[PDB]
């Protein structure tokens, strides 16, 4: 079995952004949920962007960003335990935003 694409959203505070996301069912305690997170600018493409991983988390603070610009972001998860991994889920639907000027 494979998990459903997680749900993405972007929130702001002053000018510090952050990516938030949730899954369908809460993870079992004896199983970790590995998340692959990536975000870029309309200009570049996914392929050419770094995807930093995280485990059992539902959010990620974002580095400072270029004022006045339009970004993007997607996430996907897999069920892992003791090194055995699950089927990487379909990417979350791409959520985008436009940095404040």
């Amino acid at each position, epitope marked *: 079995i494979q998990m459903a694409p997680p749900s993405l959203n972007v929130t702001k505070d002053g000018d510090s952004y952050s990516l938030r996301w949730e899954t369908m*069912k*809460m*993870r*079992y*305690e*004896h*199983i970790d949920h590995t998340f692959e997170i990536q975000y870029r600018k309309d200009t570049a493409t996914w392929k050419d962007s770094k995807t930093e991983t995280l485990q059992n988390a*539902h959010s990620m603070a974002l580095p400072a960003l270029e004022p006045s610009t339009r970004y993007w972001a997607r996430v996907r998860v897999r069920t892992s*335990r*003791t090194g*055995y991994n699950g089927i990487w889920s379909e990417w979350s639907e791409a959520r985008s935003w436009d940095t404040e000027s």
Partner: antibody
Amino acid sequence: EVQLQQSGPELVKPGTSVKMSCKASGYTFTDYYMKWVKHSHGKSLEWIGDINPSNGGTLYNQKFKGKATLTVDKSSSTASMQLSRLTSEDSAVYYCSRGDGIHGGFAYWGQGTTVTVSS
Amino acid sequence: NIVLTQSPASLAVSLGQRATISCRANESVYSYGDSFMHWYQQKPGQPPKLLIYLASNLASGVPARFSGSGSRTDFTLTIDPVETDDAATYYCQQNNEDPWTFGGGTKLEIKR
């Protein structure tokens, strides 16, 4: 030593709802899930649901969905559970347990709470 | 919903003898390398206590008389030699695929 102090015995009238608790100690509260179990009289156990004290996450057994709601309060390291629409059949012993994650199960148990539904 | 089945429901074993209890699951409980089957001892008036975790591991504090083994669907909890302190009801609980579940229990009575 891990410690699970549960609330005391309850006598409740049908149709109403109780709200037992369970104070933890002996380890970081948010490091493990709190699991609840219904040990009906003279029988085997029944899982009710777990909760991730960290983000309040929650997962229920479906037979108990809508009956029991699991809550947590970090500042005071207490996990509380609420039972509504109480009836004669809800009369049973309820335990709170702490999880492990290295085996995912009920590693430490509280002494339990005896709820009696009757008029 | 993995349905555990404990056999036999009760048994009277003599002090110093041997006691084996079986627990068979509707479906497999193995995955991610381990078998998510744990055993429990519950003494009258006493909440359950963790006996064996992850099929063969003895919980911190359990006597060397207690041992557990089994894999996909069939598990056996063995107590040898049987003691008086052991007079209790025993449970197996699967944790492979929610809803988590326990067996019907097995109450053994020390013989003497």
